[PDB]
Every structure is written in structure tokens, then in C-alpha cells.
């Protein structure tokens, strides 16, 4: 149908905007602490602690499959990256501190993204 196509164009444009958001958020992680999944070879107990692991490469795979229907789903995944880290790692670690800084810096990006998504529809 013409409607399904129009819907698919909207999704594609959402995907375009979320790709730009993702790049901006990932720049706020210059140490690449959140770039890849936590290694189950190196942290064999991880899934005993964290039930829904997340990282930027995994979000990128979802994004490129057009797997985010709206900004809320994308933000859920970004919040998992932060929240998982702040549970698994103690306050006095480079990891926890990296997550706090990512959260604080990403807030600004995500604020305008929401306005853009609402604005452009």
C-alpha cells in the first residue's frame, strides 16, 4: 500500500535521526568503555548480575535493522548501558565514573532529540 510505504519512509527517517543521536552519545565515551558487550569469557559471572546486557555495538545492529520504532525504545537501551554499569561496578571505579559522565553528557543530546522527533513527527 501507499500507507505502508509512507510508514516505512518515517521509520527510515527516524533511523537516520537515531543514527546521528547514537554517534553523538558514543562520542561522549572516548575511552570506548561501552563500545562492545561485556566479554563473558573475561567476566564469566556477568549474567548472574546483569539480566539485560547492552552496549553501543548491539544498539547499532538494532538501529541498522530499523529495529527502534520510537525514541523511547532507543533511550531504554541507552539507559541499560548506564544502569548496568552503575550496578556491576563500584562507585570508585573508572567504569562507574565513565557511566555517570555518559549519562550527564548524553542528557543534553537526548533532550534535543525528543524535541526533534516530536517536531518533525
Domain enclosing residue 84, as ranges: 1-121
Q: How many domains does one find in the chain?
A: 1
Q: Which three cell numbers stand for residue 109?
A: 543530546
Burial class (CB in 10 A: 0-12, 13-18, 19+), 15: middle
Residue 85 CA to its chain's centroid (Å): 13
Whether 81 and 100 have beta carbons less than 8 Å apart is answered as no
User: Per 3-state DSSP, what percentage of the chain is helix, strand, and coil (rounded to 5)?
Assistant: 70, 0, 30
Give the CATH number for residue 43: 1.20.920.10
Amino acid at each position: 500500500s501507499m500507507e505502508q510505504v509512507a510508514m516505512e519512509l518515517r521509520l527510515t527517517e527516524l533511523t537516520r535521526l537515531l543514527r546521528s543521536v547514537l554517534d553523538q552519545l558514543q562520542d561522549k565515551d572516548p575511552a570506548r568503555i561501552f563500545a562492545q558487550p561485556v566479554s563473558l569469557k573475561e567476566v564469566p559471572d556477568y549474567l548472574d548480575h546483569i539480566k539485560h546486557p547492552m552496549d553501543f555495538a548491539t544498539m547499532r545492529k538494532r538501529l541498522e535493522a530499523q529495529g527502534y520504532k520510537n525514541l523511547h525504545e532507543f533511550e531504554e537501551d541507552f539507559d541499560l548501558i548506564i544502569d548496568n554499569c552503575m550496578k556491576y561496578n563500584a562507585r570508585d571505579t573508572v567504569f562507574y565514573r565513565a557511566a555517570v559522565r555518559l549519562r550527564d553528557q548524553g542528557g543534553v543530546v537526548l533532550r534535543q532529540a525528543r524535541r526533534e522527533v516530536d517536531s518533525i513527527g
